[PDB]
């Protein structure tokens, strides 16, 4: 019936984090509460579950387009580095804050590494994502 693409993503990005928080087997790095997430900004996140957000918020892109590795993920989490007195420029994300996500989601079987580089997403996580999205659509109903 329902799928992943038929639902508002702005509310879906909370439920994908909540489902990973209820599981709690994500191999969290020790440095998640102290690290800056990229080069383009300076301040830490306000919430305390940013890794729990960013893990399945990275995984939802791995259903849209697979074969995408840590370079594609440091690209899609890039932003406007304000260089202060000079004009601003686009810059990447941190490599490790996506690499720990990918190492987590190949550990717990939601994605796996695939030919033509990158990660593709397993049928188990493909079941899991629209299993969440059906609940989100039921919350809409």
């Amino acid at each position: 019936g329902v799928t992943v693409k038929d639902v508002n993503q702005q509310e879906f990005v909370r439920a994908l984090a909540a489902f990973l928080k209820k599981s709690g087997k994500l191999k969290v790095p020790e440095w998640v509460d102290t690290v800056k997430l990229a080069k383009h900004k300076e301040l830490a996140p306000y919430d305390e579950n940013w890794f729990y957000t960013r893990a399945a918020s990275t995984a939802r892109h791995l259903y849209l387009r697979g074969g995408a590795g840590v370079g594609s993920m440091t690209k899609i989490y890039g932003g406007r580095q304000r260089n202060g007195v000079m004009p601003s420029h686009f810059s990447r994300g941190s490599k490790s804050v996506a690499r720990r996500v990918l190492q987590a989601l190949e550990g717990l079987k939601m994605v796996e590494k695939d030919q033509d580089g990158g990660r593709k997403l397993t049928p188990q996580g493909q079941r899991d994502l629209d299993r969440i999205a059906g609940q989100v659509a039921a919350a809409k109903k």
Binding site: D33, T34, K36, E42, A44
Partner: protein, 144 residues
């Protein structure tokens, strides 16, 4: 939660410097010298603090629980690189300076590079730009 409680610290003297209690804690302990917004959100992270609180709401002993984090960052898993007094010249330790030690350690090195007769040295005594700037056009506010 809504009203001003009893024991509402308008004033504080932490590490012998002033801070208003009308500000949030995470941006109020930035008002000490040597701790900014980046290191403040780690020393309040290692302490179990619900960080929505203003500086007048929090009670009397965690305001010294937060103090010891800075003087002992290696007690509390704050890394080598995150500090600001890293790899000292004489004793080679990684430490964190706080609101009276910064201007002291700014003496500690600049009179050293003064008395060594370095080109880095003489520019600080003259009051001139150090890092290789072009003072032909910019920097006319300081002198005359």
């Amino acid at each position: 939660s809504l009203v001003i409680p009893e024991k509402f610290q308008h004033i504080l003297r932490v590490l012998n410097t002033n801070i208003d209690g009308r500000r949030k804690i995470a941006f109020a302990i930035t008002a000490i010298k040597g701790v900014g917004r980046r290191y403040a959100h780690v020393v309040l992270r290692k302490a179990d603090i619900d960080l929505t609180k203003r500086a007048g709401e929090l009670t009397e002993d965690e305001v010294e629980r937060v103090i010891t984090i800075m003087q002992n960052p290696r007690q509390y898993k704050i890394p080598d690189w995150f500090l600001n007094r890293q790899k000292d010249v004489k004793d080679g330790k990684y430490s964190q300076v706080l609101a009276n030690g910064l201007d002291n350690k700014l003496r500690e090195d600049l009179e050293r590079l003064k008395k060594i007769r370095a080109h880095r040295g003489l520019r600080h005594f003259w009051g001139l730009r150090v890092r290789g700037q072009h003072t032909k056009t910019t920097g006319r506010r300081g002198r005359t």
